[PDB]
């Protein structure tokens, strides 16, 4: 186990604890734990190559000598998405990617008049957990979320 130098635009840098077997996703989560920038906003690079989230850090040639570059891609603007209930009737909702799955579940609870406990959401099969951010699942404008019942 060893520490990894993450540099940000501006110049500041900091240190995250990693392993040769840690994935870019696991590393991104580590950064999100360490300084609170959601993983989904993180674009990482190393020697000008962007790091895809699947590979292992050692397989990408990172080591205790390495320095990795972080750029934050946020967004102010909201987006519109669909939530297709079990009966095939979609409804249009306005969401921010920094909002929680929970706050969206509330807009749906209000609109479809269903307790939050009685349903859950999924995106392209990946189930969505209340506490996580909507950006974690790759929502794009006018995409379709499915509502599952109980």
């Amino acid at each position: 186990a060893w520490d990894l130098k993450v540099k940000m635009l501006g110049g500041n840098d900091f240190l995250v604890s990693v392993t040769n077997s840690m994935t870019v996703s696991e590393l991104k989560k580590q950064i999100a734990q360490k300084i609170g920038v959601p993983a989904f906003q993180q674009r990482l690079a190393h020697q000008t190559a962007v790091l895809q989230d699947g590979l292992t850090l050692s397989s990408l040639g990172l080591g205790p000598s390495s320095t990795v570059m972080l750029v934050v891609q946020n967004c102010s603007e909201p987006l519109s998405i669909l939530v297709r209930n079990e009966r095939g009737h979609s409804n249009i909702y306005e969401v921010f990617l920094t909002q929680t799955v929970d706050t969206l579940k509330k807009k749906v609870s209000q609109r479809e008049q269903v307790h939050e406990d009685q349903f859950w959401l999924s995106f392209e099969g990946r189930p969505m957990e209340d506490k996580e951010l909507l950006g974690e699942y790759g929502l794009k404008p006018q995409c379709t979320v499915i509502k599952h019942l109980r």
Binding site: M8, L9, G10, G11, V37, V71, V72, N74, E77
Partner: protein, 92 residues
């Protein structure tokens, strides 16, 4: 004090819009200090005012939102920064 023609008004509104989006993105890296962040706030508001106004002496087909103007600024800056009309096309 460089002489310009008219519509440099529109060009400058477009330019400064792109300038705003650079502030927006810079702030996300958490590197914009607190006074700079006010400048971003001020700049956004001064622009929307200038945009609305300009959106009136403009033919209705040529009314562009703050957002569309941002896309135009950004391609301008991509030309200036590399000194290159290639950038701002779609792939540089």
């Amino acid at each position: 004090q460089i002489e310009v023609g008219p519509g440099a008004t529109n060009a400058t509104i477009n330019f400064e819009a792109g300038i705003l989006e650079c502030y927006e993105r810079f702030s996300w890296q958490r590197a914009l200090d607190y006074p700079g962040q006010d400048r971003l706030h001020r700049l956004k508001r001064k622009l929307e005012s200038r945009i609305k106004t300009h959106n009136k002496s403009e033919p209705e087909n040529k009314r562009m939102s703050l957002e569309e103007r941002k896309a135009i600024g950004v391609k301008m800056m991509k030309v200036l920064l590399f000194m290159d009309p290639s950038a701002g096309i779609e792939g540089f």
